[PDB]
Design a binder for these strands. Sequence first.
RNA 1: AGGACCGAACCGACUAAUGUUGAAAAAUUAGCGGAUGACUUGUGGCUGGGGGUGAAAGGCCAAUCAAACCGGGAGAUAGCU
RNA 2: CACAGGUGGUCAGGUAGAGAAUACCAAGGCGCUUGAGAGAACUCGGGUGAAGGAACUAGGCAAAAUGGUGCCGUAACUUC
RNA 3: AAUUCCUUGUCGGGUAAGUUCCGACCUGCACGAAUGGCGUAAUGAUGGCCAGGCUGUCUCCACCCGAGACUCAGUGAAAUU
RNA 4: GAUGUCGGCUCAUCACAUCCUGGGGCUGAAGUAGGUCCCAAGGGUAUGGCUGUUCGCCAUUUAAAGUGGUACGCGAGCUGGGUUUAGAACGUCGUGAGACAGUUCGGUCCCUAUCUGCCGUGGGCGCUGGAGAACUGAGGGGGGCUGCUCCUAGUACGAGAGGACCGGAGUGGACGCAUCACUGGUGUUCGGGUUGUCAUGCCAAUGGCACUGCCCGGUAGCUAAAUGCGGAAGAGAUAAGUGCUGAAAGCAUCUAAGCACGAAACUUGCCCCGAGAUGAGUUCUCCCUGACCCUUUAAGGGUCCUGAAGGAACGUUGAAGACGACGACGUUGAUAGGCCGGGUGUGUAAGCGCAGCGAUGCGUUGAGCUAACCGGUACUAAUGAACCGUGAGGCUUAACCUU
Lengths: 56, 120, 114, 209, 22, 122
Amino acid sequence: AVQQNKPTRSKRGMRRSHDALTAVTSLSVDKTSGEKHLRHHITADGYYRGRKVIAK
Amino acid sequence: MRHRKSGRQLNRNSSHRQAMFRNMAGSLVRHEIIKTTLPKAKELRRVVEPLITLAKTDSVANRRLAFARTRDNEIVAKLFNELGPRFASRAGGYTRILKCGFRAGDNAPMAYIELVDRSE
Amino acid sequence: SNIIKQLEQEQMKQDVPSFRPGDTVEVKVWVVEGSKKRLQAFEGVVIAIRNRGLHSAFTVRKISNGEGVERVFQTHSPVVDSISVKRRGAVRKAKLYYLRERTGKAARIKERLN
Amino acid sequence: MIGLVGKKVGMTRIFTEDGVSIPVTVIEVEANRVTQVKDLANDGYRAIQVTTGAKKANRVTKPEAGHFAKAGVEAGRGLWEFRLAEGEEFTVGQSISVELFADVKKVDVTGTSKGKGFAGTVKRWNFRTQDATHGNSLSHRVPGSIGQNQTPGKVFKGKKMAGQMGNERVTVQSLDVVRVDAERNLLLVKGAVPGATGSDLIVKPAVKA
Amino acid sequence: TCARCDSXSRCGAXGKXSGXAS
Amino acid sequence: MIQEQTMLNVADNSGARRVMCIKVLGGSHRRYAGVGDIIKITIKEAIPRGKVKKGDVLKAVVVRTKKGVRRPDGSVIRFDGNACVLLNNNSEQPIGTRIFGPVTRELRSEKFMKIISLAPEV
RNA sequence: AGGACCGAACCGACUAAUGUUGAAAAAUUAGCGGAUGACUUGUGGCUGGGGGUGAAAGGCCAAUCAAACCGGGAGAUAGCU
RNA sequence: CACAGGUGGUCAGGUAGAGAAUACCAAGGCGCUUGAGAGAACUCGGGUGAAGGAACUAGGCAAAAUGGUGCCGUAACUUC
RNA sequence: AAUUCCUUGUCGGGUAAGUUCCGACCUGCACGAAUGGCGUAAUGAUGGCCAGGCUGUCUCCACCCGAGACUCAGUGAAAUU
RNA sequence: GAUGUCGGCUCAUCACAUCCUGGGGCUGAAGUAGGUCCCAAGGGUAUGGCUGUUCGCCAUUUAAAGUGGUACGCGAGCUGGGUUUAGAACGUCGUGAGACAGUUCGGUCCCUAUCUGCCGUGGGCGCUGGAGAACUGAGGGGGGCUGCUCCUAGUACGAGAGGACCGGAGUGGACGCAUCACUGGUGUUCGGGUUGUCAUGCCAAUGGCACUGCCCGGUAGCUAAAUGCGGAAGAGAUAAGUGCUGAAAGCAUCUAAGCACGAAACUUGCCCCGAGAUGAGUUCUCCCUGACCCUUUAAGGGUCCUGAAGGAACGUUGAAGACGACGACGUUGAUAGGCCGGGUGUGUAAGCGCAGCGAUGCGUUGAGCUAACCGGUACUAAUGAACCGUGAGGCUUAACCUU
């Protein structure tokens, strides 16, 4: 269970071809305060779907 | 496989799940809003909400059955004295899940679980 | 489900009497001897009742000619003609499986005397 | 012949008059209505394309909405296609009922079997478990050898190994049809058919005669 | 280092143990 | 559900008390013997003035299993012991002239008429 | 009373399984032998390499032993690679 | 190695127990320096199992099983 | 036979069936009397065989409970080449 | 400057010099049962006692218990009994150290898979405008075993004894697919009993720990030992074989012309995958119809307005699942949790009262609790929007609208 020949940097870049990160790009805008947040999450000031939630 | 089976194992045995659900149910009855991970916030519904359903109707046997669970006199006092007659008309859905991003140490998806009204 | 339960509740016997584990019960069963159709009786202690609507069954244990015969009877089947309760026993379980190990004077059960 | 697209409702039991148990499976076959007929002129072969049930308006797409609305027919949960036998000739918009099976005496049921997940060789191929003791090191439920030595020197195609089991199309053949009742839209076939409760089934007349 | 590990070589791998310290 | 090394009881007055099933007949790789089934037995215990002696390789027919039988409506009959009636190697209609205990309806097959006739129940 | 019996500490190591780039260059877990004796242990001391010591296996003498380790003869020699 | 190892002495609570065994606890001390999920094959450590019961295997290896106090009773052989 | 090559010698017992085991025969290749012969109660983590009990050891596997394996976040090797 | 050894287990795979099943010639082939030879590799081809054994002998089966190749297949799959390390002993050889292709007891089996292969499952682009579906089937894989009984019929055959071809049906064994209705197993997420101890101030009732403490039952799910189903029939081309007509060779001759039968082998028929079948196919449906610059003037790039069908993303999830994937659903909502009723399981809760000196019994009471099940219910969570995807689709030739 060890290699007999060193793989190339071509094969190394081909293995990492699927290691790429999907960027989010789907940030929602709160309607009350106009803050950017994740979709289905609370804001940094703490609103969710218009009405006031937790704190801080 | 897992066909039609309910209940998160939560990387624990049954004893630790029962004690941790007991402590987290006591913390949610006490503070009325707590912050935990999202699968634990979803398994906490199935633990906390039958206690409020049990505490709709006050009796000695319902109090000793709510003390067989949750093991605290102050928690069962708040169940049968406050949370019972506030949720007496609401038929289920005694609590609310609100996702709040992630956690700094392990990227755990966090969630606030709270009661519906909270009187705050 | 409504299909299944509505299709099952038109084959169920409406007159099967109530009985509990520990009740000495005589079940009468149609048997086919060649081209003759005859009742034979099977009397024994009910040691298990499984209730599922149409899929209900019950286990009857007796001692024949040396050793213990247990027949599980499908309740709503047309092979059983009658279920008659003679003695009413007093136990504290739903399954009297320990009677498989007990025989004789140690396998006596009480009578539900009220 | 043509088939009918049903839903598996579950299994139950019919008692006969002479005290015999028949294990039946219940298939709810609603109105199977033709959405398209195919012939050698426009398509190259003879077939019909049926649908069944009903579907939400907001989730059926506009190509599907146009395909159903050309026939003037209400949308259904899916689209299936059956191959004609040149004695039967059908038009677009005819509802095919369960009363077709009143004289068929035996059916073939095609379903999608239950998904077992990534199964192992013991479950998937009925391999023998090795020794639980008498020395065995970490190799109780493993496949064992998968080939010879230097001749061929490879694993052959179609080797029995671990992998996906179930969630696949399977047909059970020559099932004695017990009862066909159109008042309840039901087909009761003797035995067990592939799939979980609530899954699509295709019921055809049998072919082994 | 010094753990041995073969039946009998000067240094191979082997899960046994009388031949083998590199 | 009888296989090899199974110690059965003996349900006739042939002499033997405990037999051992050494082969289940009627097929290649055949694992289990039900109630209409022929087995090959050896004798492990007998009575001193019986018809058969210890260590005879002969046949038997299993007449009571502990796994049970199945009837067409789905009704099992579990006995509390395994018992065979000892047959002969060539000439059937068995060695014994009594049968202890009941039998089942699966021996009504034109070849065990004497067992179902001599049986006290069923 | 007893190189007595059973059994913890304590001294060992019979079997299995794990581990085998180990948690560990010899262990862990579960069972196991002795356990008032020819027992075991702390602390100090003596025996030194063809020598020691050995209820003896060529066993042990600082993870090394059919002749320890370190320095020197020494860049031994090598018809071999 | 912030290493499942090794390392002499002294102190020696409660309840149950013959006991410094063991089980639950007190005083006291800890939760063992990566977590969060999911609940595939397979590996490890365990629990249960129809009918049969050593048919397994080099071999009953491993598991299962027995298990305590009081009393009744106990063979061949023997250096008594 | 811890010894016997031919050899699984022959007879008997145990088994449905016994190259092992127990008894005996003597044709001891190649036992033999303190490099001891033959017995021998007790003892043995000693060797061979048989029986009762008991069992997933097996027919033939099934399910469940935990720790890994899988995914995400942090850190981050190794043999080989 | 290492290609690990016999035997067993697991998993195989090929050859035919075929063991059974299938076909046929000859028979010193009456029948049954054989003997021999030709064809045929589709499927199948035993469990134990002994021994480390391969083998062999034995016992009981079986339709039959095939013979070989595959590093005497198979240790980066397992074992480690044999054997070829170190201990010890016997017999023998040797003065001895020791030795024996003689014997006996004991003796550590590593590897986290890079590439090929194989089993599975995905991402990307392609398929020429984009998209959502349903297919066609080039090709490939799975399967293919057989007993016994009954009828034909105690008929044909035969001194008797015995006893069929062909054909039909039923019931089995072994294997395989599916499934959970039944019967069971499991069910540390449900109920109850009980031991020790600690705690909730105490009694009472509980909870924690002791392998789930030990048990007893048991829902759903999974599952076999449970119960449904399958192996086909038919066709086409054939092998050995049987021929018809028929010359060469006035006859004869199965062959040279021609024509007809003929087997589990082959092509189909049954099942499953399958258009990356780059030879990238077909069919149905949907959507996109606005203008300006620059120059190496074309299958060019840039700019404004536009952002369709649809898709992903996010969330609630699933009898789907390692992850992706696939399926249901997102307020015009039953997708999940909760709730309501039921069902199931356990077995007559607690509290109070009566009786008993007391343990405890009895009544309220088939009570209370009840997971994953069933049928309902918007109470809670499934947010308006954003993101990708465009703006009519090349050239040449032929034919129709319109011979």
